[PDB]
């Protein structure tokens, strides 16, 4: 390999978004540039809307995806992933004045790979509390998949970007959402968002899979091996931890 093109979305801060000059910035951009230097490959980042990001990769419009993409079983049917470069659970989001905040969380860390009756009881409790509450999620994400598969009785609206979800939650058009802690912690830590709060169980596994990874075509085994070696080195030397603290305000490195 000499040169590759990496697609990102550009609407998911602090992983990938646009600066004041319209340039793509964020953890995925800084990490991608560091990995390419390690691989001795020239890389160019390009913006791609979330809906077509996977088919444009398999159609050969670019060589990899770094766009806060969870390594999840459904996507693994279509593309390959590097080993994870970040780990994060998933949790809920509402407004700081919401009555939803008073709900007792019986299971703080809720793994979904093998749901026990106790874990199902906790998911069912939140489903019942959420029935009547209007949820908003970004379309085409594990957030949408979780609500449709695990909480089908809850009213959901899907959005083109997570930015539009947050806009509608702030405006009171929706009452709650779901996303990773890696997205929600920096969002709620901003003084701009003192009116927003994370809540509920922190979920992992199941349809969410594990980790955030670089999406690569299945046939590109050598490119996956190059990324895996570079990611292992960036984790080992503390680069991923450094970038995670810079962008997220905490260490989400594997």
Ligand X SMILES: N=C(N)NCCC[C@@H](C(=O)O)N1C(=O)CC[C@@H]1C(=O)O
Residues near ligand X (CB under 6 A) are 9, 11-12, 16, 50, 67-70, 88, 138, 141-142, 162, 179-180, 182-183, 208, 212
**Judged by CB, which is closer to ligand X: 13, or 100?**
13
Neighbours of 158 (CB within 10 A): 17
**Judged by CB, which is closer to ligand X: 94, or 182?**
182
In order of 46, 123, 233, 247, the CA distances from 7 in angstroms are: 5, 35, 22, 19
- Contact, 43 vs 3, CB < 8 A? yes
The three-class DSSP label of residue 61 is coil
* CB 173, min distance to ligand X, A: 19
* CB 214, min distance to ligand X, A: 13
The three-class DSSP label of residue 175 is coil
Q: Is the dihedral angle over the CA atoms 139, 211, 26, 57 positive or is it negative?
A: negative
**Judged by CB, which is closer to ligand X: 17, or 126?**
17
Task: Pick left, alpha or beta for residue 215 (phi over 0 → left; psi -120 to 50 → alpha; otherwise beta).
Answer: beta
**Judged by CB, which is closer to ligand X: 162, or 230?**
162
Cα separation, 11 vs 139, whole angstroms = 13
**Judged by CB, which is closer to ligand X: 138, or 239?**
138
| Residue nearest ligand X, CB atom distance | 70
* CB 2, min distance to ligand X, A: 27
* CB 61, min distance to ligand X, A: 17
Cα separation, 189 vs 56, whole angstroms = 34
* CB 189, min distance to ligand X, A: 15
């Amino acid at each position: 390999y000499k040169s590759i093109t990496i697609a990102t979305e550009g609407s998911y801060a602090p992983y990938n978004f646009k600066d004041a000059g319209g340039k793509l910035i964020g953890f995925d951009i800084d990490l991608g540039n560091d990995l390419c230097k390690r691989m001795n490959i020239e890389c160019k980042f390009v913006e791609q809307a979330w809906d077509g990001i996977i088919p444009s990769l398999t159609a050969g419009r670019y060589d990899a995806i770094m766009a806060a993409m969870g390594i999840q079983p459904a996507r693994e049917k279509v593309i390959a992933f590097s080993r994870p470069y970040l780990l994060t659970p998933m949790t809920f989001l509402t407004t700081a004045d919401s009555p939803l905040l008073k709900t007792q969380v019986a299971i703080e860390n809720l793994p979904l790979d093998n749901i026990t009756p106790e874990q199902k009881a906790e998911l069912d409790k939140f489903t019942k509390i959420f029935e009547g509450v209007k949820f908003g999620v970004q379309a085409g994400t594990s957030h949408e998949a979780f609500m449709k598969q695990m909480m089908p009785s809850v009213q959901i609206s899907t959005y083109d970007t997570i930015d539009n979800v947050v806009m509608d939650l702030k405006a009171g058009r929706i009452d709650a959402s779901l996303a990773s802690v890696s997205f929600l912690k920096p969002l709620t830590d901003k003084p701009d968002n003192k009116d927003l709060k994370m809540f509920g169980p922190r979920m992992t596994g199941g349809l969410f899979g594990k980790g955030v990874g670089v999406g690569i075509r299945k046939e590109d085994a050598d490119l996956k091996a190059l990324f895996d070696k570079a990611i292992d080195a960036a984790i080992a030397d503390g680069t991923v931890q450094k970038l995670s603290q810079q962008w997220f305000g905490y260490d989400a490195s594997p």
